[PDB]
Design a protein around this ligand. Sequence first.
Ligand SMILES: OC[C@@]1(O)OC[C@@H](O)[C@@H](O)[C@@H]1O
Ligand SMILES: OC[C@@]1(O)OC[C@@H](O)[C@@H](O)[C@@H]1O
Length: 91
Amino acid sequence: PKSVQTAATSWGTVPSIRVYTANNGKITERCWDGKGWYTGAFNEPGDNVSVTSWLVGSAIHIRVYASTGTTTTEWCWDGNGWTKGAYTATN
Ligand SMILES: OC[C@@]1(O)OC[C@@H](O)[C@@H](O)[C@@H]1O
Ligand SMILES: OC[C@@]1(O)OC[C@@H](O)[C@@H](O)[C@@H]1O
């Protein structure tokens, strides 16, 4: 059977949670900061998604790896918007 594909990350003690869903070639984002789920700003093409995040002090940084075909694109959140990162594959 078919299934959407998700990736999740969280930070802090509230916590904040971000869940990324690849569905029909589009990746969207759902967010929790303790008071209900809502739709996040992230919207990029892809059929597979992974994510990692880390804190520097109180500031979150998120990296989303979106794959279409053999091409993986890294998207970066650093507090002020999503930008394309420097990631490229080995071969
Ligand atoms: O406050 C929500 C938000 O700014 O949190 C950080 C990232 O998850 C963004 O995509 C998202 O819109
Ligand atoms: O632009 C932000 C950046 O430098 O952050 C660290 C890595 O995620 C890099 O690929 C990325 O380009």
